[PDB]
Design a protein around this ligand. Sequence first.
Ligand SMILES: CCCCOc1ccc(OCCCN2CCOCC2)cc1
Ligand SMILES: CCCCOc1ccc(OCCCN2CCOCC2)cc1
Lengths: 157, 157
Amino acid sequence: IIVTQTMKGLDIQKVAGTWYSLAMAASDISLLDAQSAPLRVYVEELKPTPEGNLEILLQKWENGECAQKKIIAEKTKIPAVFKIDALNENKVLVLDTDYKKYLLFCMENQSLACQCLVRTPEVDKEALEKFDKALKALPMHIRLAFNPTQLEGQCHV
Amino acid sequence: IIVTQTMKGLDIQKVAGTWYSLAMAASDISLLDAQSAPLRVYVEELKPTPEGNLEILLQKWENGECAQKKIIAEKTKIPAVFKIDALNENKVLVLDTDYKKYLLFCMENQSLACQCLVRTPEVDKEALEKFDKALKALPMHIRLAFNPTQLEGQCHV
Ligand SMILES: CCCCOc1ccc(OCCCN2CCOCC2)cc1
Ligand SMILES: CCCCOc1ccc(OCCCN2CCOCC2)cc1
């Protein structure tokens, strides 16, 4: 465990819909540095399922182009923690959300990336303040923030 | 002007000697993102001159290799502000330093990069706290921090 902060009383159905990745931070620079870095992922829409699993729609820069991706995160016994299947066991945690404006999450596993999601392409200084407070507890070495023009573009260009 | 914060009473001869670039931040992601990004520069030594100009020794990743660079920053009427000659007029400002441990500086010109320099390859949390306070005033969108192993390597690898 590195991330311990979780949303109390999370109702996953209420995170459905569109989101923007306003800012991102990660434990290691290589996770976010280039446009093609592995965790440089731009979240577009969250689609929880009736059983309370979570489909995640996002964009990622791969092979010189902006690709659409669709991921499923399986629920656990903890409502704020989900699991993605891979060669390694990857954990997704919801740290905090008010449903209507911002959502903070982290993905982990020793290594870690977190984002501040917002509902609209605006610089929400209070959401970023809450993101930065949550990151105080974590060993981050790279932090990115994006402007409204980028959020409204493709793969944040 | 963007950066307004300057070291009161700066004695430039006292910044001489070795330094490490513990952390960096910039106004635009492309200034720092890849290892070959333009402002990804790792400061190794400062050499003020008898007339109070400033030679700067650093490393930069260029063309797949770590190159040694030597730059001169010319003094101005303001002791904390220096100027580098280029196709554009580039301004270097000393924001704060205690000479013995940390030094904060920014280079500017609309666009901007700042670093936290430290004397030894240790994570100085107080120096980073002071860096982050100074950056609160500035429109940064990328921030990097480096670990002791990287500081002791070549071009921070
Ligand atoms: C409540 C917020 C849930 C969103 O969490 C995630 C967002 C993006 C993720 O993407 C991880 C990287 C996706 N890979 C990119 C490269 O291709 C394979 C998928 C994972 C979880
Ligand atoms: C008091 C601290 C002074 C140090 O300030 C600077 C540090 C690094 C700098 O480097 C700027 C980029 C150098 N270029 C890299 C690419 O080749 C040409 C030089 C400039 C000022």
